[PDB]
């Protein structure tokens, strides 16, 4: 979904 947001 995102590069590193989780």
């Amino acid at each position, epitope marked *: *979904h995102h*590069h*590193h947001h989780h």
Partner: antibody
Amino acid sequence: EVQLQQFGAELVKPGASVKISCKASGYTFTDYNMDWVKQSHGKSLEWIGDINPNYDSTVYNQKFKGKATLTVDKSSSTAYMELRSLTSEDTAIYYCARDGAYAMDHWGQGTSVTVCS
Amino acid sequence: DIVMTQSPSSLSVSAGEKVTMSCKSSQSLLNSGHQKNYLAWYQQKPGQPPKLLISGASTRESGVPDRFTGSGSGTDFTLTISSVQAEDLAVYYCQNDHRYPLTFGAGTKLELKR
């Protein structure tokens, strides 16, 4: 040069719904998520959520679940936030920001949403 | 759920003075697989949107002068201006850029005194 241009209605009655628009130019729209940020008059900053344009996947701050809906139109490089059941507490400037690997490195100018009480 | 705290709230300044704002997170912003603290700093002037100064705790964006240095790790971070100039009189925010939900500090305002 990168640009995110914001449009939308400014003045709304309580109980209205408003669809804010964010038009992205100067970069591959699908290569970055899009964040939405609320800044109230207290200058408090609150992240509302993001959308991935490639998949239409969203993540919401629980505080704004239902209150905000996030859509994109990939064809026109445009992201949308729909604010629903507007209360005076929803009065703020709303920003879209581009969010890839380096946080929110470009911001729209902001759409001021005023809800008369 | 991560909470950001900055200090001080306000800060008087002067020509060429060095300033230091603190940012402390309730939980580590350290992504160990990425080997990266995912903390970001923004500068906001009245009328304008916030502007990214630093991402990943220490990385200055293009057009950000060397005078701005971010440092820290885990849960404790600082933003330092070696020689304050007039254009730096703004509000500064740090941001959890690490875990959903993304959260912001309340800010640190560089109000000049006199």
